[PDB]
Design a protein around this ligand. Structure first.
Ligand SMILES: CCCCCCCCCCCCCCCC(=O)OC[C@H](COP(=O)(O)OC[C@@H](O)CO)OC(=O)CCCCCCCCCCCCCCC
Ligand SMILES: CCCCCCCCCCCCCCCC(=O)OC[C@H](COP(=O)(O)OC[C@@H](O)CO)OC(=O)CCCCCCCCCCCCCCC
Ligand SMILES: CCCCCCCCCCCCCCCC(=O)OC[C@H](COP(=O)(O)OC[C@@H](O)CO)OC(=O)CCCCCCCCCCCCCCC
Ligand SMILES: CCCCCCCCCCCCCCCC(=O)OC[C@H](COP(=O)(O)OC[C@@H](O)CO)OC(=O)CCCCCCCCCCCCCCC
Ligand SMILES: CCCCCCCCCCCCCCCC(=O)OC[C@H](COP(=O)(O)OC[C@@H](O)CO)OC(=O)CCCCCCCCCCCCCCC
Ligand SMILES: CCCCCCCCCCCCCCCC(=O)OC[C@H](COP(=O)(O)OC[C@@H](O)CO)OC(=O)CCCCCCCCCCCCCCC
Ligand SMILES: CCCCCCCCCCCCCCCC(=O)OC[C@H](COP(=O)(O)OC[C@@H](O)CO)OC(=O)CCCCCCCCCCCCCCC
Ligand SMILES: CCCCCCCCCCCCCCCC(=O)OC[C@H](COP(=O)(O)OC[C@@H](O)CO)OC(=O)CCCCCCCCCCCCCCC
Ligand SMILES: CCCCCCCCCCCCCCCC(=O)OC[C@H](COP(=O)(O)OC[C@@H](O)CO)OC(=O)CCCCCCCCCCCCCCC
Ligand SMILES: CCCCCCCCCCCCCCCC(=O)OC[C@H](COP(=O)(O)OC[C@@H](O)CO)OC(=O)CCCCCCCCCCCCCCC
Ligand SMILES: CCCCCCCCCCCCCCCC(=O)OC[C@H](COP(=O)(O)OC[C@@H](O)CO)OC(=O)CCCCCCCCCCCCCCC
Ligand SMILES: CCCCCCCCCCCCCCCC(=O)OC[C@H](COP(=O)(O)OC[C@@H](O)CO)OC(=O)CCCCCCCCCCCCCCC
Ligand SMILES: CCCCCCCCCCCCCCCC(=O)OC[C@H](COP(=O)(O)OC[C@@H](O)CO)OC(=O)CCCCCCCCCCCCCCC
Lengths: 66, 66, 66, 66, 66, 66, 66, 66, 66, 66, 66, 66, 66, 66, 66, 66, 66, 66, 66
């Protein structure tokens, strides 16, 4: 291959792909955010956000390939 | 593994997962919020919010994996 | 433990759990609210609210664990 | 040919064209960015950005020829 | 399955379906409400409400599937 | 196809279409809402809402195609 | 033609025109939004919004040409 | 003519005039924006924006001469 | 046809037209209401209401076309 | 014509004019509403409402031109 | 004339004047709104609104000159 | 005169004075805005706004001298 | 005079003073409102409102000076 | 005097003091507002507002000194 | 004295102290603001603001020494 | 004393304490309000409000110390 | 002591502690607010607010230590 | 020790730790803020904020170690 | 070893690692910042920031090795 930077996928996928700790933390953050904002406001949009983010990331990562 | 940040789960799960003190505090806050807002308004939605949040967090955390 | 915030339960439970002064004050507020609103309107719902709040908080706090 | 620098396309295309690791990383970054910014703000524009970037790069690279 | 949120039925059905404690409590509330409002007003509609709610929930839950 | 985002239907339909857990939960919520609001107010509109929502979603989803 | 960017219509129409997955998802979102907001508020405007959006997009896309 | 840059109109008009792919894409973007923002907020201004932009561009381009 | 919502008649007529279970239930409710209110008051208007409602619905549905 | 939005009448008339499914559904709703509210209250105004709405829509649509 | 923007009246009048499709749609919307809100509430103000809007627009457009 | 910019009044008055197409368009916009917002809300302030704007502009332009 | 806005009285008095078309329309509206609300409710207050408004405006305008 | 801005009172008092056209217009607006809101709602507070504003401005301006 | 800027009090006090034209204008502005906002909203807070500002400035200036 | 704002009591007590013109005006307003609302509704609560407000202010001001 | 800012308590306590003029003014404001809002609305909550604020401040200041 | 900056704790703890004048002032500020905002709005959240801040700081400082 | 700068870790770790006075001061700063910003705005994000920073630093320092 001529892609001089090709080897970087091992750690980029490791750290930033769907299964990485960083991605999992972002999803976790929504569960917590949903809980506290709903508690505070009772606005149902805060609960739907969880399903939305999980769906978004799932599609995004599939398309990105990571 | 190639996930350079993998070790962070020990404290992220500790502090922000289902069993953490932060999550428990958010649930507690609803019990109190339910009580005072119902006292103030007598609007039953304030009481249902407790069951809703507990259910939401339970599902969310299971899905998040924490 | 890995829960970096674990120590906070001593005062959170103290101040916001079932036996705290804050919770007791909310219950007291209903007794007073019940009395004055019933006096004003004679609508029996104002009297039932006391039993409802006491029951709600009792269940909520048990579930929350505080 | 008289293009003294012609041979450079092998690595430029390898590293910076549509299929390179660099380009893939930029797309991945949007998936992550979308996720975290939506989590933070709930502003839907953050989710649309993914489809926009993928579309943009696809067109751009086709036109550029890489 | 592709329903990313599928696992949530275990607790949603548990807590909010026909046999849950929440639903049973709502029905109980009508028995009490019927009793006190009839006592107060002698308007027979308060007694019929019990049969109506029980019938409604039975049909609703069957249709909802919970 | 030229629709760069086409693959997303597998999970969007799974999670948000007519048969998904999210949609079923919204319908369930009406059964419960109908029950409690009718109990509270005896206003028949709360009972009709169930048939209305079920009908609405059925038509909407058919038209949306999910 | 002199439109240097002309080729972009293949994917723009694919991803953002009337028949694309993105557009279909927006319509689906209204069915769900209609359902939950009507459930919550019983305000009929939430149901009419579905017919309105479908009509709007149909006209808009025809005029846009996508 | 003495306008040293005169020849540029062939591609400027091609790419940036009324009939170009760029202009069409901007109009399309409003149809989509209108749809999603109305879905989110139900604020009618989002629907009127389509007619406004189409009208604006039509006048603007006529005056500009492209 | 240009009526984007045309397909909805299959279930609207099914659920809300003259022969639907909802309509039949409303008529049944009058038989019961007539019986109990006449029992309570001996006011003949309660008995005539049955013939009136049946007649009303019959005409109304014919005119509505369902 | 200079009305840039002229083509929209095909679907607006289809979906929202006198003969559309939406309009027919609104009329049907009155037949049902009349029936149930009269059953509940015996207030004759509920029966007259049907003739009133049919008359209103007939005049309104004629004037609107749809 | 010195009004650099004068030519815009051809489409502004076409799209936004009294006879345009946009204006007709707004009037139609009242017929529908009147019908459904009267059905829901039986408040006569909803019926008068039609005559009011038609009168308002007629005067307004005459004064505006479109 | 010493006003180096004096000649600009020919087009400023043409385009931005009382009789210009821009000013007429702003007034037209109120007729439309009044109509749609009144339709939506039935708040009479939306109708008075037309007379207010016409009056305001008339006074303003007289004072400005354009 | 130093009142920079003094000239505005010609049209303010014309349009909004006692003899203006706007004021006359408000009075007319009461005659109609009185008629329809009395027809609907037979509550005499609706008839007295006419004399009250006429008296109010007469005094108000005299005091205002318009 | 050392008040560098002292001369401004000639026009400030002219335009914004008790006797100015601006102040008179605000008072007039209440007469009209009172009339229309009372017509609409029959809530007597709308009539008292006139006496209140006149009294308020009279006191305010005396104190302000304009 | 060693205060190199001491002489500035003659005009600062003149222009910005309690008795200056600037301060008087700010107070006047409240009388007008109170009047128009109360006219618009009937919210009594707009009337109290006058007494509040006068009191505030009086105390503030005394403390400032100007 | 170290209370930098201490001097403000002279005017705060003057304007807002028990004997001030503002407080007297609020009490007067109740006499008038009582009169007109009783005239309108014959609901005795409007008359008791006078004794209640006078009593409230008397106690409040004593406690406040003004 | 090592608290470099320690001396600030003399004036902070003076101006912002329980006995300061600022705190007394806030309490006074409630007496007035209670009076006027009760006069306006007859909602008893406005009267209870006085006892609530006095109690709150008393506890708060004790805990704060000022 | 190798911490070249170690000596700074004497004044950092003095000025910014739990017992410092700065921290005490922040807590005091909430008592005052609670009082005035509750007075203004009657929104109970303003009162709870005191207990929340005291609890937060107590936990935070313990964890920080100051 | 060939790392000519190796000895620097004694003071770098001392001053800038997890246990240093500098790091502790940054954490302390958040406790204070959280307190004051929450006091000012009541936005819960200010309280969560403490747990977030503590968690971040803990992970970061572990990974850095200091
Ligand atoms: C430090 C303690 C944290 C747990 C406290 C929970 C016990 C008390 C909570 C409820 C009392 C509030 C009044 C009830 C309900 C109420 O009326 O107030 C809710 C109110 C927000 O209401 P909004 O302004 O959205 O409401 C608008 C309308 O609803 C007006 O009524 O104030 C809050 O934000 C309370 C939440 C504070 C944050 C609570 C959760 C804290 C989560 C983070 C835990 C800390 C992690 C970091 C630790 C260092
Ligand atoms: C500092 C004292 C806190 C406890 C006070 C309780 C004793 C008195 C309570 C009831 C008297 C009110 C009149 C009764 C009933 C009544 O008519 O008023 C209820 C009224 C709210 O009513 P809404 O405006 O929702 O009602 C709308 C309609 O119902 C109109 O009637 O005012 C309140 O919010 C009272 C609650 C104040 C907050 C009370 C709970 C405080 C919880 C926090 C405890 C403090 C924690 C922080 C400590 C620093
Ligand atoms: C925690 C306990 C929940 C179950 C309590 C049921 C037993 C007692 C219920 C009836 C006594 C009320 C007086 C009877 C009838 C009565 O006169 O009061 C009904 C009254 C509401 O009446 P409205 O104000 O609509 O009435 C207007 C006119 O009818 C005036 O008469 O108050 C309520 O909302 C009671 C409902 C409280 C909520 C009850 C259902 C709770 C559902 C949620 C269950 C909890 C899930 C969360 C758990 C943490
Ligand atoms: C996690 C569980 C979600 C499903 C829960 C459904 C079972 C219980 C629902 C009804 C109990 C509420 C009391 C009944 C009725 C009632 O009185 O409360 C309705 C009330 C809203 O009422 P408003 O404040 O609009 O009412 C104003 C007036 O009507 C006052 O009466 O509270 C809600 O928003 C309840 C909806 C919570 C959201 C329910 C739907 C959730 C959809 C999303 C599903 C989750 C997707 C994400 C999963 C992670
Ligand atoms: C990835 C999935 C995208 C499609 C999801 C649609 C199914 C579920 C949607 C509705 C559930 C929300 C709750 C209903 C309704 C509801 O209550 O929430 C609406 C709420 C916004 O409401 P506002 O805050 O404006 O409301 C203010 C007041 O109305 C408060 O009630 O949250 C949203 O923005 C939802 C929209 C998320 C975005 C949905 C459209 C996504 C378009 C882009 C598609 C993706 C393209 C990129 C793909 C990578
Ligand atoms: C789920 C079952 C629905 C059908 C039940 C019909 C059989 C029993 C009906 C009559 C027994 C009531 C006592 C008789 C007569 C009586 O005295 O009570 C009538 C009473 C209302 O009376 P008002 O309060 O207007 O009366 C004021 C004065 O007349 C006082 O006497 O209560 C009702 O609203 C009953 C109607 C419940 C709704 C019945 C119709 C339901 C239509 C919707 C069908 C469901 C569609 C959704 C399905 C999920
Ligand atoms: C694309 C189609 C546009 C014409 C549609 C008209 C036919 C149906 C309209 C009425 C059905 C709504 C339910 C009736 C009445 C009803 O209950 O809903 C009215 C409701 C707004 O009500 P609010 O929320 O102000 O009401 C508060 C309280 O009244 C609650 O009841 O929703 C709307 O905004 C409807 C208006 C949508 C916009 C309609 C006008 C569109 C003008 C622009 C035309 C398009 C120009 C751009 C074209 C690309
Ligand atoms: C190119 C055409 C310009 C004239 C168009 C006028 C006909 C249609 C106007 C009203 C339809 C909007 C919906 C009605 C009312 C409505 O609901 O929308 C008003 C809405 C703004 O509302 P806000 O967001 O401030 O409202 C906040 C709340 O009121 C939410 O309801 O959108 C606009 O800004 C419309 C104005 C567009 C600009 C109109 C004036 C253009 C002036 C410049 C003229 C052009 C000079 C340059 C020419 C090249
Ligand atoms: C363009 C025409 C303006 C004049 C129309 C007057 C003739 C018809 C008026 C009464 C018919 C309404 C039904 C009667 C009575 C009735 O039942 O409806 C009154 C109803 C408002 O009632 P609320 O909703 O406050 O009532 C609550 C309860 O009373 C429910 O019954 O609707 C209105 O706001 C009508 C007023 C429209 C505005 C009328 C005055 C217009 C003033 C501005 C004049 C225009 C200046 C700008 C010109 C461009
Ligand atoms: C240029 C003319 C200015 C004077 C016009 C006064 C005559 C007509 C006024 C009342 C008709 C409005 C409908 C009545 C009452 C009504 O229902 O509408 C009041 C309404 C505001 O109501 P809100 O939206 O606060 O009401 C919320 C609820 O009350 C809903 O009912 O609209 C206005 O803001 C009207 C005020 C326009 C501004 C009037 C004062 C102008 C002061 C400045 C004078 C100009 C100085 C600059 C000159 C260049
Ligand atoms: C040159 C004249 C300066 C004095 C003018 C005072 C008389 C009229 C003032 C009130 C009419 C405004 C409408 C009332 C109230 C109103 O509704 O408008 C208030 C509005 C600001 O409101 P916001 O946008 O903050 O309001 C947000 C919400 O309240 C929306 O309602 O506009 C202003 O800023 C007016 C202030 C202009 C500045 C006035 C003070 C000038 C101080 C400086 C004096 C000059 C020193 C330099 C001299 C060269
Ligand atoms: C400048 C004069 C201030 C004192 C005026 C008092 C004499 C007349 C008062 C009562 C006549 C109102 C009709 C009676 C009763 C009535 O029906 O109207 C009460 C009504 C408010 O009622 P709501 O809209 O809350 O009522 C909802 C339902 O009760 C509908 O009936 O209007 C007011 O807000 C009147 C209060 C104006 C403010 C009065 C107090 C002013 C306090 C400040 C004093 C000024 C300090 C600043 C000076 C520059
Ligand atoms: C020098 C004194 C410092 C302590 C003063 C505390 C006593 C009074 C505090 C509250 C009165 C404010 C009005 C209450 C509440 C209120 O309504 O105002 C809060 C307001 C900020 O509100 P926002 O603009 O975020 O609010 C947006 C909306 O809430 C609008 O309501 O103003 C402030 O920032 C006050 C804080 C000043 C800073 C106070 C803390 C000082 C910490 C530093 C201590 C000094 C260290 C250096 C010493 C040299």
């Amino acid at each position: 291959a001529t892609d001089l930077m090709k080897s970087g996928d091992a750690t980029v996928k490791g750290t930033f792909g769907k299964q990485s700790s960083v991605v999992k933390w972002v999803v976790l953050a929504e569960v917590v955010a949903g809980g506290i904002m709903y508690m505070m406001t009772k606005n149902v949009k805060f609960l739907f956000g969880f399903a939305i983010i999980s769906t978004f990331i799932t599609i995004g990562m599939s398309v990105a390939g990571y």
